Amino acid sequence: STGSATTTPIDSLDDAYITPVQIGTPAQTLNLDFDTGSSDLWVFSSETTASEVDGQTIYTPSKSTTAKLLSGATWSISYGDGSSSSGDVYTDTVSVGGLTVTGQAVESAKKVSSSFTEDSTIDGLLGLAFSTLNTVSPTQQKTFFDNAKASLDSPVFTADLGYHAPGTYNFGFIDTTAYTGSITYTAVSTKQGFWEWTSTGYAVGSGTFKSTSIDGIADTGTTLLYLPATVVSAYWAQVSGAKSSSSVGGYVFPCSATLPSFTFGVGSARIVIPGDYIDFGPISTGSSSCFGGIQSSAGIGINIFGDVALKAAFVVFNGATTPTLGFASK
């Protein structure tokens, strides 16, 4: 089997991407944030505290002929932005892009935090990290990808995120038309449950490439690129008037600037992030201070190759017995 679904940015900044997902019978279509940095498939639901729902489409298990309570199971999750949700669990049929899984754990939110409530465009998350991170208790559940594996033509999914444009998530195949050149594969550690890999270095603009090992995770659910403070300082030093602002929460730069590109290494290959991708616009409406898309990972405890980095590439998440990541330019 295969599946193929379009993913669409939620706003003009590419703050996140949503992908339609069919849940239940008859189908209930919800727009989920596919997150390679977590392992729960959770949704706004008919169970979600009413004051915490503001415009999201909800899953109603009582209207699905294939829904069944997973008796006794609960879940509770916290994300890197400090957001959270929790609830109970159903099993149901879930389809993405024509690929169907029966018996998928669909985590129904009873409570979501204010960041979720305030974002009417995201109806839930679909986790694509390793199932060892799934929060369901007392019986941990598998991700959609882990349940679909048995069945896929190739045990892979790919992320092809757009810059200010739609992109694609494919399951079970490589679309050799979607990238240029060759795909460079690199080793993955699953020890922390993430798609964790080691970049071979970086360059700033037209500068020389610095060979240096940078461990981090490939995380479609994180907007920005978070790297060590040394690397980030070297990048923003090339932008006149850029500075780290404790009041704003990271590096800011004059909106009048033209940003340099940022290159990261994948083995002997190089992925170039255009300068424009690193612009996250005014810090507040009408400000001439703009927020940077490359930020320090210091205090976060891990480096994160979020959407800023990933949307510069065609990315293969290879879930074979020995998982690997692949990157190609596009």
Ligand SMILES: Cc1ccc(NC(C)(C)C(=O)O)cc1
């Ligand atoms: C609506 C919304 C969108 C995204 C986030 N961030 C997540 C994905 C939870 C994270 O992993 O930091 C929180 C709320």
Ligand SMILES: Cc1ccc(NC(C)(C)C(=O)O)cc1
């Ligand atoms: C273990 C380790 C790994 C990498 C580096 N280099 C850094 C600090 C990322 C750089 O800025 O070049 C240093 C130590």
Ligand code: NA
């Ligand atoms: Na922000």
